[model samples]
Target: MRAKGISYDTGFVKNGATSRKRFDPDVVERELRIIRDDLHCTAVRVMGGDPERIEVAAAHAADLGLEVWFSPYPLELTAEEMLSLFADCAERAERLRRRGAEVVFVVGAELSLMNPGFLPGDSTDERVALLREQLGEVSARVNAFLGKAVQLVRERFDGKVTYASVPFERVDWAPFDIVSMDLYRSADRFTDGVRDLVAQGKPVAITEFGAAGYQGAGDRGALALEIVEYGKDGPVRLKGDHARDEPGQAAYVRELLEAFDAGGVDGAFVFTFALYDHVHRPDGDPRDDLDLASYGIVKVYEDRLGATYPDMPWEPKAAFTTLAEYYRG
Candidate 1:
C-alpha cells in the first residue's frame, strides 16, 4: 500500500445544504500540512461538488507534494446533470495535472443512490432503500453509465481515472485504470473485495472507508451519520445510547489498515480527516456534541483553540496518533 491518504472535503451539497463551506487557501494549506506531516498521509482525496473548490484544494494538495484524487461528489442530480458535472470537473482536474500534479480523476461516488435516473426515489434515504431493493437490476445500468462517464472524462482529462463505488455497484473495471471501492462493511469483508479487485489486474484502492466516533460506529461506517437525527437548529439527538468511544474508533482504523495492507490492495484512504459540521464541544451535552457522530480522526472546535496545539481549532482523537503510527510503520 503506497498511497496513505485521507479525503479533504471542500464542500458536499445535500438538499441544498452545503456539508462544508470554508475554502480559504491558508486554512486549506494548514490542514493539508497536518495530513502530510502529522498524519503521515501521502495523498489527499479532494472531494467537492463545485469545480473551483475541487481545483483549489487539489492544487494545494499537489503543491504540498501529495497525490490528488479529484472527486466530484454531488447529490440528487439526474444522469444528464451528472455527466455535465463530470465533464466540467474533468476539465478542471486536467488543468491541475497539466501543471505537473499527480492527479487521479474520480467520476463520481455511489451514483445509484446519490444521483437520479438509476433508482426511483425523491429523497436520499428512499433512494438508498430502492437501491437495496434493486441492486442487481440497476448494476448493469450503472456500469453502462460508468462506461460512458469514463469515455466523457477521458475526452478532457488525460490522467488516471477511477470511480468510487459501493460493494454492489458492479462497476466495469475495463474502462478504468484503477479498481476502487468505498468499502465500509461491518465485518472483515475487505479480503473478499480486494481479492476480486486484484483479480482485475489493475491497481486497487479503497477510495473511502471509516467508522464514526460513537460506541458502535466501528460497525456503521458512512451509515453512522444516517442513524442519528438532527433538527432545524442543529443535531437534536443520536437515536440511542451511542457513547463517544475514541479508543474504539482508533482500534477500528488500526484493524482496517492491517487488513488492507495484508489483503494486497495498492492503496487505502481512511474515509476522511475532518468534517466541518461535526465540530468538537467541551461540554458534556450530547446535543451540542456533534463530533460524536463525525468520522474524522480529529474533532474541530467551534470557537476555541485546541490545548495540544494552541494555534489550531481542532484536536486529535485517539485514531489520529494510531493512524500516524500505522502509516509510519
Candidate 2:
C-alpha cells in the first residue's frame, strides 16, 4: 500500500455532544508525531465534524510529513448542512495543500444511514434496519448527493478526492480520483470484495476497517459497537461483561492489512489510533470497561498517564505493536 495510514479522531460531534472532550493542540501534535514516527504510517486521515479542528490536526500531521486525508464526518445532518460543512473543510484543506502538503479531501462516509433525507429514519439504527428494503432508493439518493458534493469540493480544493463508502451505498466512483470503502470482514466475500474494488481501474483505499478490543469482536465486525448500551447522555455500559482480547484485535488488524497489501490496495487506514471516551478500567465492574467496545489500538485512561509514554493518556495495546510492525515492514 502506498499510503499506510491510521484515522486520527479530532472529535465526533453528534447530537451537539463531542465524544472527545479534550482537544489540546500540543497533545494532538504529539500524537500525530507518534503516528508517523512510531507507527510508520505514511498518511493520517484527520477526521471530525468541526472544520477548525480538522484543519489544526491536518496541519500537525502535514508538518510531520504525513499525507493528510482531510475527512469531515457528519452525523445526523441534512444534505444541505453536509454540503456546507464539506465546503468549509475544502477551503481549509486547500490552504494546507498550498503550503506544500499532500492532501486528499474525503467528502463523507456512510451517508445514507448517518444523515437524513436519504433513509426513512431519524436514528442510525433505524436507518440501517430499513436499508435492505430501500437499497435502490438509498443508492440513488446517495449518488445524487455525492455528485453535487464532489463538484463542490473540487471547486475549492485542488487535490485528489474520495468518499469512504459502505458497499450498500453503491456510490458512483466516476467523479472520484480514488475508490474508497469503509469495509469490514463481516461479509462472506470479504477478500473477493477487495479484489473487485481494485479491479475498478482506480486507486482503492480501505478508509476504515478494524475490530474492537473484545472477544468475538472480529465476528461482529462493524456491528461490534452494538454491545455498548447508550443512555440519554452517551455510552453507559456494555450490554454484558466481555473479556478484553488485545491479541485477537491485533490479529484481526494484521490479517486485514496483509490482505489489503496482497489484494493491491492503494491505501488502508486503520479505523483509529485511539478512542478517548472509551477509557480502560480494569479494577471496576467489567461492564464499565468501555475499552472492550473500542476499535482504538491504544487503551485510553480516564485519569493518569500511560507507563510507555507517560506524557500520553493512553497505553498501546497489542494491536498498536502489530500495526507498528506491519507498517514498518
Candidate 3:
C-alpha cells in the first residue's frame, strides 16, 4: 500500500514458464542488475520467497538506492497459515530494514467477504466482524516487526478482486488503508476491474496491471491507447496500442497515462519488472509454480529451494511510463 512500491520477481520467472528459454538463476540476476543500477526505482515487490535471494536483491537496491516491499499471494492457507507467513515476512523485512531498506509487505485481499469459500464462511455482519479481527491480528503482527507506518497492498478488483463482479455490499474486506489491484482492458469492458474500490474513496495502490507487449486481432485502439487518458491528471499519451499475443514492448505502453488517469488510482507499479531474466523450467511441478512465478518488476535467480542474484535491463518497458501516471494523481 505504500504509494510507489513496485514488485520485483525474486524466484518465480526463472523456473516457472515452459517457453523453452529454460529458466536460469544467473540470467535472473543479469536482468535485475539493470533495474537497480539503472532504474533506481522507488519501490519493489517480489513473489520469489527465497530468504537468501531477498537479502541479495535488497542489497542490490540498497546499493543503487530503491525502496523494497514484499508480496506473496494465493497461499491457499487458512488464517493460521498466514500467521507463519507473516512472521517469515517480518523476519526478512527486519533484516532488510536493518540494512537501510524501506520495505513493506503486501497483505493482498483475496478472501472475499461475500463468498467465504465454505470453510471460512461468514455472513455480511460476521464478515465485518471477522475482518476487524483478522486485520487487527495481522496489523499487530506487522506493526510489531516494522512500524505502524507499514503498508499492505489490498487487491480489490471485479470478476476477480474487482468489486462489480461481486457487489458493493461485499466490497468491505479488511480495513486495509492501501488498496491495490491488477488492472487491464478486459476486452473493452468499460466497467473496469477496480471501479468499486475507487468508488469507495480510499487511498489506492495499483499492484499488478498492464497491457500486453503488442497489438492484437481486436481493434481495441482505445483500449490499446491505454496511456492517453488513463492518468489521474493530464499529459496523457497513447500507450496501450502495444498489446498482442507475442508483442513488442513499444507502442504496448504508448498510452499508459490515459489509464492511470481514467482509473484515478494512486500508485501504479509494473507487474513483474524482471521476469524475462529467468529460465523456462519444466512446468506442472504444481508447488509454487501453479500460478505465480511471473511478471515481477525486479528479476531474481532460482536455486535449490532458494534464490540468487541475476541481471537487469536498462530501457523502460513501454509500461514504465505508467509508473508516472499515478504520480500525477
Candidate No. with top TM-score:
2
- Over 1-329, each residue of candidate 2 has an lDDT whose tens digit, in order, gives 99999999998788877778899999999999999989999999999989999999999999999999999999988888899999999999999999999999999889987888988998999987774557788899999999999999999999999999998888889999999999789655668778888998899999999999999999888889999998765677999988989999999999999889978999999998998888899889989999999999999999879999989999999999999999999
Candidate 1 residue-wise lDDT, 172-288, digit = tens: 788899888887768746677667666777999899888898888887666788756766533555665557899998898888888788778888889778887777775866755
Give TM per candidate. 0.94, 0.98, 0.51
- Assess candidate 3 and give its lDDT: 0.41
Quote the lDDT for 277 in model 3.
33
What lDDT score is found at residue 30 in candidate 3?
A: 50
lDDT of 1 at 283: 80
Question: 195-289 in candidate 3: lDDT tens per residue?
Answer: 55567676566665544333351233213323233222211233323222322332333233355546676655555464443322223332222
Worst 10 residues of 1 by lDDT: 232-241
Over the full model, what C-alpha lDDT does candidate 2 score relative to the true structure?
A: 0.92
- Score residue 139 of candidate 3 by CA lDDT: 35
Best candidate according to lDDT: 2
State the number of backbone clashes in model 1: 1
Q: Which ten residues in a row have the lowest lDDT in candidate 3?
A: 156-165
lDDT, candidate 2, at 99: 98
* Local distance difference test, each candidate: 0.83, 0.92, 0.41
Cα-based lDDT at residue 202, candidate 1: 91
RMSD per candidate (Å) reads 1.9, 1.1, 12.8
